[PDB]
Design a protein around this ligand. Structure first.
Ligand SMILES: CCCC[C@H](NC[C@@H]1Cc2cccc(c2)CCCCc2cc(cc(N(CCC)S(C)(=O)=O)c2)C(=O)N1)C(=O)NCC(C)C
Length: 370
């Protein structure tokens, strides 16, 4: 059923995960970025120094022009283009063809990455955050409307240059995870917004007002590399991580992700870096669950060299690839919930392991929403 979709994701570290798609008639093959942090489907449609290939509207009999412009700004990079529609397929996905909105990228700034091997982006979030407005139906909505594909998809992102993973469209693949799935409500259908109710570092509560954790918002974004935290939360976390690792001293700019830390190969002191536990709101009253991430996740490999992959945000908490790696993440749009489970490619060391645990009791969870 879903075995055809296992391992359909490829990528380079820090440069996102992409799936193979085809657009137009006859089909044009492109590598498309998988992004739960946006809602626009767009592809390079003009020559660019970093593009191996691009979408040629002229060669598609099925292309239709919508005669409207569009731009999308991301935390990293931005592009503008022309709106249109065409037939789209996913070779290593469901056996269907849909007519979907496509943005033909004609100009861009720091969007395409030299050597990334992808030429477009697939925004998997909801219409509310689509550009220019919410009348531009996102791809997955079109897929569900035009076909019998269930309103659900799941992402298994695996870590270590080259990375891989699975995007299971229309269901859940049980051979890809162990233990139970734990679900947190989608608070509002715009980004995939959730609510963090508690934070622990090495078993110690950060003891901040839980509103700070979701200050503005908290989202699940496969398009973002880092765990991005609101300033106050970032400072609290960094202070604690500095304290646990204090046995060693690191250039101050390491903590800002500006310069690397290097250790002799096989000598990396993982044990001085703490585990981080994020408690998410559960499905029943006063009930949370926690996901625990290891330093191997937020110390992204770049002698063995690493970059601190926890950074500041002015748009709320962004749970990026460092969080999603090692877990099987289910985007259950039909039941307005996001599931977490330990992935089959989960990260662990000799004494510590990434985990999804519950149930936990957490009082006044509704107070944590901004
Ligand atoms: C409200 C938050 C929304 C986040 C959301 N992020 C998704 C985008 C998609 C996207 C765009 C370009 C390239 C990639 C992927 C490939 C990987 C590059 C590394 C990276 C990416 C992001 C972001 C980073 N970082 C920060 C800036 C460099 S980092 C280093 O991981 O902290 C790195 C980021 O914002 N990817 C967004 O911009 N949505 C658009 C909006 C109009 C709906």
């Amino acid at each position: 059923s879903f075995v055809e979709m296992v391992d359909n994701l490829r990528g380079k570290s820090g440069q996102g995960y992409y799936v193979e798609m085809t657009v137009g008639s006859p089909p044009q093959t492109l590598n498309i970025l998988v992004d739960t942090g946006s809602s626009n489907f767009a592809v390079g449609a003009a020559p660019h120094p970093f593009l191996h290939r691009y979408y040629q509207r002229q060669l598609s009999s099925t292309y239709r022009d919508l005669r409207k412009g569009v731009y999308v700004p991301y935390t990293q990079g931005k592009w503008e283009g022309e709106l249109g529609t065409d037939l789209v397929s996913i070779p290593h996905g469901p056996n269907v063809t849909v007519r979907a909105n496509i943005a033909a990228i004609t100009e861009s700034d720091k969007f395409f990455i030299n050597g990334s091997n992808w030429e477009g982006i697939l925004g998997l979030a909801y219409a509310e955050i689509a550009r220019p407005d919410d009348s531009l139906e996102p791809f997955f909505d079109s897929l569900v409307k035009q076909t019998h594909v269930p309103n659900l998809f799941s992402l298994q992102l695996c870590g270590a240059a080259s990375v891989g993973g699975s995007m299971i469209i229309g269901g859940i693949d049980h051979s890809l995870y162990t233990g139970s799935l734990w679900y947190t409500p989608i608070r509002r259908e715009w980004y995939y917004e959730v609510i963090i109710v508690r934070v622990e570092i090495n078993g110690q509560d950060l003891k901040m007002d839980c509103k700070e954790y979701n200050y503005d918002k908290s989202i699940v974004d496969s398009g973002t590399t880092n765990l991005r935290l609101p300033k106050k939360v970032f400072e609290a976390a960094v202070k604690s991580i500095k304290a646990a690792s204090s046995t060693e001293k690191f250039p101050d700019g390491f903590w800002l992700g500006e310069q690397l830390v290097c250790w002799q190969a096989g000598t990396t002191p993982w044990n001085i870096f703490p585990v981080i536990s994020l408690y998410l709101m559960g499905e029943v009253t006063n009930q949370s669950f926690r996901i625990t991430i290891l330093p191997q996740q937020y110390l992204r490999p770049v002698d063995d060299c690493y970059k601190f992959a926890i950074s500041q945000s002015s748009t709320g908490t962004v749970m990026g690839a460092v969080i999603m790696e090692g877990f099987y993440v289910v985007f259950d749009r039909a039941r307005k919930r996001i599931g977490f489970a330990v992935s089959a490619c989960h990260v662990h060391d000799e004494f510590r392991t990434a985990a999804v645990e519950g149930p936990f009791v957490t009082l006044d969870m509704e107070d944590c929403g901004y």
